[PDB]
Amino acid sequence: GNETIETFLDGLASSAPTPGGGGAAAISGAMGAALVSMVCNLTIGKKKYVEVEADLKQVLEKSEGLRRTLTGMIADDVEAFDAVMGAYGLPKNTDEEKAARAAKIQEALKTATDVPLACCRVCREVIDLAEIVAEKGNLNVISDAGVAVLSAYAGLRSAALNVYVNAKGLDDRAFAEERLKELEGLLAEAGALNERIYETVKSKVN
Amino acid sequence: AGNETIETFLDGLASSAPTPGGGGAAAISGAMGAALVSMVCNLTIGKKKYVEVEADLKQVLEKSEGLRRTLTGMIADDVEAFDAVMGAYGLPDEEKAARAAKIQEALKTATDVPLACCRVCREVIDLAEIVAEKGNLNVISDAGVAVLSAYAGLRSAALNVYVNAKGLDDRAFAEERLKELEGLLAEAGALNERIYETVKSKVN
């Protein structure tokens, strides 16, 4: 958030367990969400585009919403990660310490499934926002609509791996099935949608 | 630039500033790909368990870290090259052939810059494979996030090659660049999927 890019890449490169893939996914996300706001901000007020203005106004509120949130998620990853390690590194001597570690690990893995899925959900919304500027956007900047979708799609599939990892560790299979089923679906659509919107933009560029 | 904060970059990326742009974003997408290949490498070197792949991952670590440094620089290279295309079209019969020359000059750079980022992102994808095979099983997810961030960069940057190639007189140049471009692209689809499935099946 309040942190240099080279700083983030130094830490992301380092042997520190954070930043890692989860935080990158979120950045891949918030970049998607930014490149929609861009095509919105450079198409709105353009006299030749006063028949899509209002739509692209509504898109802009959504995308700015989703950028704010997705920037939050860079650090939500670290919180979720700490929770898992905090639980995993608990005393393990008596059965009063064993049992209270099982529970706290389960509680931690559930949070470390919801938090990446929340980013998935927002990344899948970003792909929908990009379809719209890929179809209504100023042709001068139509590429940004294409980079937008690729970033969002990278975010979604990135974040999705942190769902698979923490999901598999759960004792409550019910809760996991629901979450993996919610992911399984988010990904079904996003596959062909990212190509459509990437290939559409490629065509509008030539 | 990579000197900017993640909020300051995103505040400008979202704005109606012509910079930052999708070329900026593609640069960052690549660096994080390099960054993550370096992180698996850093979390596998000095694990006694992973001695057999230590030297191999040592050679990968130095490659990735050079690709990261390059790709981070390429954030600014995109703004510089785009600002000189904006600059050439801003120019005011002698006044008019001066301007069509400067523009063609500017658009050949505006093609070469994103193709280099394309070239580098393609190389992150190969290191993202070695690490996906040889890397520490408790951070293999990062091998995955790597391949994705790198593939996004590649195709994000591909689009800026197409935008600038389109407006070029010299068509021997332009088609030579589109051939190179489509020569990287051709493979990148096939790897990115093989690598992700491989990382997907190691976490599950």
CB-CB contact of A125 with A159 (8 Å): no
Dihedral angle of Cα A200, B112, B32, A61, to the nearest 10 degrees = -40
Choose among B188, B192, B170: nearest CA to B180. Answer: B188
CB-CB contact of A197 with A145 (8 Å): yes
Cβ-based neighbours of A176, under 8 Å, separated by 6 or more: A113, A167, A168, A170
C-beta atoms of A24 and B36 within 8 A: yes
CA–CA–CA angle B204, A159, A115 (5° rounding): 100
Q: Is A120 exposed, middle or buried (0-12, 13-18, 19+ CB in 10 A)?
A: buried
Sign of the four-CA dihedral B139, B143, B144, B146: positive
Sign of the four-CA dihedral A102, A108, A114, A117: negative
C-beta atoms of B14 and A74 within 8 A: no
C-beta atoms of A13 and B39 within 8 A: yes
Give the up-direction half-sphere exposure of residue A37: CA atoms within 13 A in the CB hemisphere: 24
Mutate to test the interface with B, among A18, A88, A126, A158 (most CBs of B within 10 A): A158
CB-CB contact of B26 with B153 (8 Å): yes
Sign of the four-CA dihedral B126, B128, B132, B134: positive
Q: Indicate the SS3 state at residue A43.
A: coil
Choose among B182, B179, B161, B185: nearest CA to B108. Answer: B161
DSSP letters of chain B?
-TTSBHHHHHHHHHSS-S-S-HHHHHHHHHHHHHHHHHHHHHTTTT-GGG-TTHHHHHHHHHHHHHHHHHHHHHHHHHHHHHHHHHHHHH---HHHHHHHHHHHHHHHHHHHHHHHHHHHHHHHHHHHHHHHHHS-TTSHHHHHHHHHHHHHHHHHHHHHHHHHHTT-S-HHHHHHHHHHHHHHHHHHHHHHHHHHHHHHHHH-
Could you give the angle at which helices B22-42 and A5-13 cross, rounded to 10 degrees?
Answer: 30
| Residue A14 to chain B, least CA–CA distance (Å) | 6
CB-CB contact of A26 with A74 (8 Å): yes
Comparing alpha-carbon positions, the chain B residue that sits nearest to A32 is: B25
CB-CB contact of A26 with A76 (8 Å): yes
| Residue B94 to chain A, least CA–CA distance (Å) | 28
C-beta atoms of A143 and B151 within 8 A: no
- What token pair was written down for A93? 């001597």
Residues of A in contact with B21 (CB under 8 A): 38, 144
Residue type, A124: R
C-beta atoms of B25 and A31 within 8 A: yes
Of A4, A9, A25, the CB nearest to B31: A9
Give the up-direction half-sphere exposure of residue A139: CA atoms within 13 A in the CB hemisphere: 7
Cβ-based neighbours of A190, under 8 Å, separated by 6 or more: A124, A127, A153, A156, A157
Residue type, B44: T
Measured distance CA(A205)–CA(B158) in Å, rounded: 11
Structural domain harbouring B60: 1-204
Residues of B in contact with A183 (CB under 8 A): none
Measured distance CA(A5)–CA(B195) in Å, rounded: 26
The torsion angles phi and psi of B17, rounded to 5 degrees, stand at -65, 125
Sign of the four-CA dihedral B179, B180, B181, B183: positive
Number of domains in chain B: 1
Mutate to test the interface with A, among B3, B8, B9, B13 (most CBs of A within 10 A): B13
Measured distance CA(B71)–CA(B157) in Å, rounded: 12
* Strand (E) or helix (H) holding A134: helix A95-136
C-beta atoms of A24 and B2 within 8 A: no
Choose among A51, A169, A130, A8: nearest CA to B75. Answer: A8
Cβ-based neighbours of B129, under 8 Å, separated by 6 or more: B147, B191, B194, B195
CA–CA–CA angle B11, A159, A67 (5° rounding): 20
Comparing alpha-carbon positions, the chain B residue that sits nearest to A35 is: B14
- What token pair was written down for A181? 């089923």
